[PDB]
Design brief:
The complex is a heterotetramer, with two copies of chain A (120 residues) and two copies of chain B (30 residues). Chain A is built from seven helices and five strands, in the order βααβααβααβαβ. Chain A is mainly alpha-helical and 120 residues long. The two termini of chain A are 24 Å apart. In chain A, 38% of the residues are buried. In chain B, 43% of the residues lie in helices and 0% in strands. The chains are: A mainly alpha (120), B mainly alpha (30). Chains in contact: A-B, A-C, C-D. Chains A, C: InterPro entries: PIN-like_dom_sf, PIN_dom, Type_II_TA_system_RNase, VapC_family.
């Protein structure tokens, strides 16, 4: 019932228990952006886990970028002064009515529908 | 009966434990 | 019969005749990535042209990101040492068998299927 | 006849002149 940003997934695969508890705090049918998928899969190749990381990611609902999301991303970038991939993920969460779970307080604080589960 | 309940409870957990299995296997994978 | 990178389109809308001649050098049914669409539309809002820029962009074939493109982008990033949005656009061009027309020599030189039409 | 030709030539340009019209209208739009 929630969308997860790249940073948490990276933390998970990197062995942070904090990330494990972030995912467990939300019910299955958890979603990620196709961007997050690509960003994570890049790390999988570097650490040579590509096959097993893919099977783990495939348990997530993986949301591609519609033009709905494209339109919203453009708007959100101006409104919230966001980097574009941040905007696309935020747009993805909004249109599917999901809460955005992210470690980024800097950019996303003060934006409704955003939850920062942990810091360090 | 219900008994429609309790077959709600499962399948309601897991789901929540492939999830736990998926997550736990994913932790420190790299 | 070709895919155009963001920089040329930005140049066009910015009144560079060099960009006009780049587009004219290639036949209609020219394509752009959905990324390029978003990057350009961001500029349209800033300069308040959003409506008219959209009608111009709509003449392009606008290719969204399939998982084919997602897979290829990941691979190309490692191989060619590319920034990810560069990789996605290159992946988009390859899978649709289009030449990539771009002002970026720095990143894309030595990669087949890439044409740099002009410098300055 | 052909005459199948020359109705190939047009519609073959435009296309190439909405394109020129699209491009020319887009130049310096901002």
């Amino acid at each position: 019932s929630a969308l997860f940003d790249t940073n948490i997934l990276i933390d998970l695969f990197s062995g942070r228990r904090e990330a494990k508890q972030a995912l467990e705090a939300w019910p299955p049918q958890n979603a990620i952006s196709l961007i997050t998928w690509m960003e994570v899969m890049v790390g999988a190749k570097k650490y040579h886990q590509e096959q097993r990381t893919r099977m783990a990611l495939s348990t997530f609902n993986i949301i591609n970028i519609s033009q709905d999301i494209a339109e919203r991303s453009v708007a959100l970038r101006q409104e919230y002064k966001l980097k574009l991939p941040d905007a696309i993920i935020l747009a993805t969460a909004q249109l599917h009515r999901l809460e955005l779970i992210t470690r980024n307080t800097k950019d996303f604080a003060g934006i409704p529908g955003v939850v920062t589960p942990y810091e360090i | 009966r219900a008994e429609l309940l309790r077959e709600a409870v499962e399948q309601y957990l897991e789901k929540q434990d492939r999830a736990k299995d998926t997550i736990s296997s994913a932790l420190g994978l790299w």
